[PDB]
Structure 1
């Protein structure tokens, strides 16, 4: 089969994980998507000439059993760590996601991309400079997106695939 990349989208409720995923997969903006639904989605794409499958888990937070969270973190090859630019707590929550994914994978080298969503809003509490400083501390890429206009969307997912390839070649 063609290569499949298992991507996981994490971050606080309300940041735009579902909207980002649906924009990536279906090329439309979805206004209201029940915040409690967690599902996986697939798309066949071409990234830098490679025809591959993206298999994306749109997470929704606590699970019935914490074992289920540990399971999808071990399964997942790369993580989009999403905050919203107008929600400071969602940015502070990134430190928790960064640590928990490393912890469950028992790894210091986990492909990740920091995503600041909702860039289309003028309302902003997290300045690009402060998100860049966080991503520099982690040594990972940072991309500002808008699931509403689709700006940055393919970059965020495709950049995570590229990070996974750099991990796999070691």
Structure 2
């Protein structure tokens, strides 16, 4: 079984742990319980082969920690989960996005954007805003909901699919990017 290091990030109150518990234990939470160090590992089957998903939860209510940089560096897949019912969460993504870049020491990493609480009438952030945003950074966006449990499984499968193609792409492109450029005359 292939092991995958998955790390989730996001602001506090977006329903980060809600997604994990709803996907792993298949249960829902209602109590606002802040997480510090949660470890969820489930054995599933993605694209035929057995896939062991190792997800490490984060603390939404925390500042810059050296210990956070440690386990975040061990993560290969990053999921930016935010609630579209809060403008702060949409802006906070920029902080985390740049943070991950520094931690992984790479400007290009496997990250997926997810707008939780999409079934709530408090949706202030429009899908178009997220679509345009994600498009500008070359990342995908999923309208996941823990309450409805829709788009949950696929959101995680998306990361694995991109990671597989990423590792494969590494040996295909070879950090070449482009060849030669020439203008007219």
The TM-score normalised by the length of structure 2 is 0.86
Task: Give the greater-gyration-radius structure (CA).
Answer: 2
Hey, what's the Cα distance between the residues in 2 that align with 1:62 and 1:164? Answer: 28
State the distance in 2 between where 1:109 and 1:45 align: 27
Secondary structure, aligned partner of 2:40 = strand
Cα shift at 1:37: 3.4
**Over 4 Å off, 4+ runs:** 62-65
Q: Cα deviation per residue 1:112-169 (whole Å; 9 max; x = unaligned)?
A: 1000001121221100000001110110110011101101101111111112112211
Give yes or no for contact 2:111–2:159 (8 Å, CA) kept in 1: yes
SS of 2:39 mapped into structure 1: strand
Gaps (5+ residues) in structure 2?
Answer: 169-185
Q: Deviation per CA, 1:76-127, whole angstroms, max 9, x where unpaired?
A: 0011101101011001000111110011111122111000001121221100
Report the alpha carbon displacement of residue 18 of structure 1 after superposing the two structures with TM: 0.1
Distance 1:64 1:142, change over 3 A: closer
User: SS at the partner of 1:22?
Assistant: helix
> Which residue of the partner structure matches residue 33 of structure 1?
32
Secondary structure in structure 1 of the residue aligned to 2:93: helix
| Partner residue in 1 for 2:139 | 140
- TM-score, normalised via structure 1 length: 0.93
- Whether 2:91 is the aligned partner of 1:92: answer yes
SS state at 1:37 partner: strand
CA distance, structure 1, for counterparts of residue 109 and residue 135 of structure 2: 15
Q: For structure 1, list consecutive stretches of 5 or more residues without a partner in the other structure.
A: none
Change (3 A) 1:108 1:24: same
Distance 2:50 2:86 in 1: 36
- Considering only aligned residues, what root-mean-square deviation do their CA atoms show, in Å? 1.5
Going from structure 1 to structure 2, the CA distance change for 1:63 and 1:127 (only over 3 Å counts) comes to closer
